[PDB]
Amino acid sequence: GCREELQNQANFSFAPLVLDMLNFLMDAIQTNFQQASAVGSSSRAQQALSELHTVEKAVEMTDQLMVPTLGSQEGAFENVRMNYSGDQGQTIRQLISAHVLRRVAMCVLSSPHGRRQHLAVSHEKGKITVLQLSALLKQADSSKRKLTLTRLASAPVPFTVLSLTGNPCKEDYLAVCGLKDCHVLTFSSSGSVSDHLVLHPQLATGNFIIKAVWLPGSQTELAIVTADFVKIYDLCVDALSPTFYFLLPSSKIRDVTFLFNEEGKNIIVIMSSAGYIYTQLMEEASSAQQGPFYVTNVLEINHEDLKDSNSQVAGGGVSVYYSHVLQMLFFSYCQGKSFAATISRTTLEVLQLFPINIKSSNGGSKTSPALCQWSEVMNHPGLVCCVQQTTGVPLVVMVKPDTFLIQEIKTLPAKAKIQDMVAIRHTACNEQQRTTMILLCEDGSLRIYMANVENTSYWLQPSLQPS
Amino acid sequence: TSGTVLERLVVSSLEALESCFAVGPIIEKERNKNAAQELATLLLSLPAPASVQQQSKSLLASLHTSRSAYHSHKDQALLSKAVQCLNTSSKEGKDLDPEVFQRLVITARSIAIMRPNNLVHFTESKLDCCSFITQLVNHFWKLHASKPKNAFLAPACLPGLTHIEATVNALVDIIHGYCTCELDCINTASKIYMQMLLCPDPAVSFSCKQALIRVL
Amino acid sequence: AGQGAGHLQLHNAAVDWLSRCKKYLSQKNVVEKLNANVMHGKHVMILECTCHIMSYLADVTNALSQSN
Amino acid sequence: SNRLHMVRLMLLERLLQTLPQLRNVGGVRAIPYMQVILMLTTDLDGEDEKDKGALDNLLSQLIAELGMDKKDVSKKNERSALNEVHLVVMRLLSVFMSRTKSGSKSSICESSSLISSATAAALLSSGAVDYCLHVLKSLLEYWKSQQSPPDMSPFFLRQYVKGHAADVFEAYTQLLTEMVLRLPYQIKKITDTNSRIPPPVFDH
């Protein structure tokens, strides 16, 4: 009822005052507004990856990265321990004692774009059981509730299982590897076997299949690596004659990884028992159409620890693994020294080298145990899992751009020696992206662990992820 | 308002500007209109939450008695920023960020939706005709080529485009609006259209086809 | 209360009050503390106090603008 | 709607110069090139002189691209990308033929599609019956020796796409035979319905 008086009072304009704070608060208003939303997330991620490439890193031990939540009872799984009953059982025993081969008794069928969450577990009786993990993944409570596992299906395999690898490009395909045979299973949406095929490696006498690796980003292409040679087949056309055949002039084959150059063509890295690292550009010249190709190039890595003794680099290597997400090659040697090489995509030369000096919680052990079975959690960049060649303890490593966060996964009680490892990122009841880590021990007990969001979600932050 | 503190301060400052320009005398309004509209166009230009954009555009609309002039100033400001950033990125040869790419794409799409006449008039005004078209198509093609052939091979960061169909639909609606208003550079557009039609990826060729059906 | 006579006085207080609040956010120490992005301190509380006082200014001006 | 009308007329005339670059692209890679023409011909009102120049001009270039006078027909049996572009272009001509202008309640039988009549006249002038006969002779020996995918409509039924998503082009010979037995029927019936067009000559 005083509109005219209100206008007369407001005749002293505050717009000059409004602009004369706004002008000098703009200095931070602009900064916060540009920080708001996903603006700059791409640039932040690019600078984070560049400093990961460049900045030197030191290794620290920790335990807060990984938090156990649930623990299954003993005997939940039957005949988990392999007694190696058979003619090849003694050979497998000798190989595992020599630690040349590592047995992977399970796998997971799940893809970033797919819906599957299947868990395949192998038995000694030549049977692999496919199981649904929906109930296990949806249970986040840390109580002592009895786990309920719904057996999706099962399939008897006519030869001993040493490794199970699900195709990372598509959850549909699962490869089963033993000492001398390879199988490929295409599973239905309910976990039942829809298709079954057998690969024929035509192995020579005295050689054993090390492992079968799917070519990254490639569906029907599988490379079977043995102790002497690698054979690369494409299931889409031929399962008898491999497209590529790679051999090693001297010493035995230990491990094989793959990467792609700037153009995109794949490159195979083979690290041998002699400790030498070799690289090969796969193409028509090196294709199996022209016959076996012997790998000749040798990577030149010069380090004080890496001494070429009696034609062996640190007494031979253990495992090799290139990270597609991190654009960097992991490797380790029999002496227990682990190295991370950032390598040029065009000259194939290591641009930078990062040591990984693993220090145990107890001071009794000085030398670090050898690293093998590198495993990277899909949709969770930076987190890798490895196992010890000599002791078999799991080790979870986060490659921070400036540091190396390592953690040993020790289960209480220690009577249950952990046999195999897996880790899947999935959704929760509250539609939260959570990383659940499933350990299988020798007693058949399952250990359920969970990735600390305050410690394991650096790359998963909205400031580093595009919307 | 659960947003940031400075964002809340900005909302309050702009509603105070509304207070001044709805309560105050006409004299102070016409003195402060220049600075107020300049600051409003600025804050509209730079990235910020949607609420402050909405209130700033409401302020600027209330400032102008005629809607056409208001929308013309908004168009020239934002399109000039787009032109300068695109020209700088093209000249230096850097890879345009996908986020700023989609911001520019959606802004241009909205402008074409509302007034393609003014959009053509400014984006083709001299600050060869339809060079804007050539450069934006070139940027699209470099970004698409930079995108990895397989999403699996991509690292934690994803180079290239993410929502291909939305981007191509926005680009084709831009070209169609320009063809409706401008007629000389059509001989160029045909070529780019055909380049969009022979692309190996079905999700771009078929998307451009169905966009042509829905718009023409 | 009633027809809104209180707005004739309280707004006047707001007229100086935010200006008073301005006389706190213009100092170099205060803006430096803001740039450090620290929640604890009198600067953040006073900026919320501003937000509120010309939020009340909004509450009166919207009614007066819809009084047409 | 005028400005859009000349927009389509120009766009049609631009696409006509770039037809021949589709020689090596591949059939599966080239359907939308003609799918867009299908709309470009929707409001194709024949009465306009510029429009009818555009029509008969495009008919002439598709006829020339088909190359009905080469008579070198022993290569049409095998599967080659240029053969598939022939197949899709004649499928486009077939879709043009099947397009009928729904007339009013008038009893006159001359209310046929202007596009269809023009296509039929052009094909009869170019003499497609001879090519039909030669290609049939070429494929007689072949026959006696024989003893989420994108929306592909209307060139291929969506059921066909969902049944042969691996390759809609595996049955190239069957599709070519269906095209070359179906087209003469339609040109014959449209010529019968039109008194002005003389019936085509057919021998034993």
Curated annotation (Swiss-Prot), chain A:
Domain of life, source organism: Eukaryota
Subcellular location: Cytoplasm; Cytoplasm, Cytoskeleton; Nucleus
Modified residues (Phosphoserine): 85, 111
Signal peptide per UniProt: none
Disease involvement: Episodic ataxia 8: A form of episodic ataxia, a neurologic disorder characterized by episodes of poor coordination and balance. EA8 affected individuals have attacks of unsteadiness, general weakness, and slurred speech. Additional variable features include twitching around the eyes, nystagmus, myokymia, and persistent intention tremor. Inheritance is autosomal dominant.
Subunit structure: Component of the SIFI complex, composed of KCMF1, UBR4 and calmodulin (CALM1, CALM2 or CALM3). Interacts with E2 conjugating enzymes UBE2A and UBE2B. Interacts with RB1.
Entry comment, domain topic: The UBR-type zinc finger forms a pocket that mediates recognition of type 1 N-degrons. In addition to substrate-binding, the UBR-type zinc finger probably positions substrate proteins in the proximity of the bound and activated E2-ubiquitin conjugate to enable their ubiquitination.
Family: Belongs to the UBR4 family.
Biological role: E3 ubiquitin-protein ligase involved in different protein quality control pathways in the cytoplasm. Component of the N-end rule pathway: ubiquitinates proteins bearing specific N-terminal residues that are destabilizing according to the N-end rule, leading to their degradation. Recognizes both type-1 and type-2 N-degrons, containing positively charged amino acids (Arg, Lys and His) and bulky and hydrophobic amino acids, respectively. Does not ubiquitinate proteins that are acetylated at the N-terminus.
Protein known as: E3 ubiquitin-protein ligase UBR4
Organism expressing this protein natively: Homo sapiens (Human)
Gene name for this UniProt entry: UBR4
Residues of the full protein shown: 1794 to 2260 of 5183
